């Protein structure tokens, strides 16, 4: 079929985190921030073409929570099975030395939706203009998330994306250079 | 160590505009679909035992059932209306550039949306051509690394050709040997 519009919510205990997002043909439209209780368009431009009062999603999320407590009691506190992710580090544009680019770390086919992702420059942790998508939904109910390191091609310069998912024995780490 | 997870996912599938609209409500506990309302069925179905009571109870809720039955209109058709206005027909043309690897040349289509594309090489062929496939960059752009092995034959031209529905006119980029 031609197009898809997924409204994906989740709640998880005891980390007590929510996500409420809208997807289209695989890319996020917007999501609601639980802390700032505000709509957050994936691209700023979408704010111009539509709106969504965030209080509806926090209503829903708070109904998701109660339903979690119920299913746990009903399921005899059987935990979620941790499925660990696969990973890809790759440049956003083609690489040309001295010209700004973005390094994408894409984390795929994992559950549950918790990640400790750490971007690394020549072995030194690095955070400058770092961004990440929300946890994106999949048809098998596992997840994917996108991490972005704004960076400058360099030849003599290696970047590592490390993830401390507790579906892993040891950190998963993928390198990239010129 | 003991995490417990619950996913609600409301799905609208559209074909041929909005003359084919499928609604899917799914309740997913620890990654297993338990109960699902599907518009093409018209009622909740318990996928696992854990559902029965809810599906039983929800189909008994005559008022909510009509809400769900009607969602292909009030929810799907509506939300698609709003999308048609910017998202649905979003095009963004690629940024096609060629170079050697690590002979083996690499046609690098970048920044293109939506995904569907036709990348090809020529010697002014099929064999020697290796693609990554379509790659979500998560910013509503795709890329694709279509590479091609080649003996560096003297004064021969390799053209990488890219017809995408962004601009009717095909982008093409050359590399002389």
């Amino acid at each position: 079929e031609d197009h898809v519009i997924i409204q994906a919510e989740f709640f998880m205990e005891p980390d007590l985190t929510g996500e409420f997002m809208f997807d289209f043909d695989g890319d996020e439209i917007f999501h609601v921030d639980m802390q700032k209780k505000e709509t957050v368009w994936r691209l700023e431009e979408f704010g111009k073409f539509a709106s969504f009062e965030a209080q509806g999603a926090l209503a829903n999320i708070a109904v998701d929570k109660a339903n979690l407590e119920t299913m746990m009691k009903r399921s005899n506190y059987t935990p979620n099975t941790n499925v660990p992710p696969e990973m890809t580090v790759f440049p956003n544009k083609a690489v040309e030395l001295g010209e700004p680019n973005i390094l994408i770390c894409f984390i795929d086919k994992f559950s549950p939706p918790v990640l400790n992702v750490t971007w690394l420059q020549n072995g030194k942790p690095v955070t400058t203009g770092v961004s990440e998508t929300v946890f994106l939904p999949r048809e098998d109910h596992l997840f994917r998330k996108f991490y972005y390191l704004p960076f400058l091609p360099s030849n003599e310069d290696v970047y590592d994306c490390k993830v401390e998912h507790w579906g892993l024995e040891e950190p998963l780490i993928k390198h990239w250079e010129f | 160590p003991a995490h417990f997870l619950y996913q609600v996912k409301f799905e609208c599938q559209f074909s041929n505009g909005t003359e084919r609209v499928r609604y899917l409500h799914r309740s997913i506990y620890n990654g297993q679909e338990d109960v699902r309302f599907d518009s093409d069925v018209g009622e909740f179905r318990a996928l696992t035992e854990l559902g029965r009571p809810r599906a039983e109870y929800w189909n008994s809720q005559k008022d909510y059932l009509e809400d769900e039955r009607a969602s292909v209109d009030t929810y799907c058709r509506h939300n698609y209306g709003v999308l048609d206005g910017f998202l649905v027909h979003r095009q963004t043309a690629p940024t096609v550039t060629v170079f050697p690897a690590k002979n083996l040349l690499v046609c690098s289509v970048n920044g293109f949306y939506p995904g569907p594309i036709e990348v090809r090489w020529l010697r002014d062929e099929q064999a020697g051509v290796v693609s990554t496939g379509l790659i979500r960059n998560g910013d509503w752009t795709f890329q694709m690394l279509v590479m091609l092995e080649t003996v560096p034959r003297s004064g021969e031209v390799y053209t990488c050709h890219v017809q995408h529905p962004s601009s009717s006119s095909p982008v093409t980029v050359e590399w002389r040997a």
Binding site: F22, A57 | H25, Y75, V82, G85
Partner: peptide, 12 residues
């Protein structure tokens, strides 16, 4: 131009 949401109800 407004997106509209479906809501779940609860379980006793």
């Amino acid at each position: 131009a407004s997106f509209i949401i479906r809501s779940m109800p609860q379980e006793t």
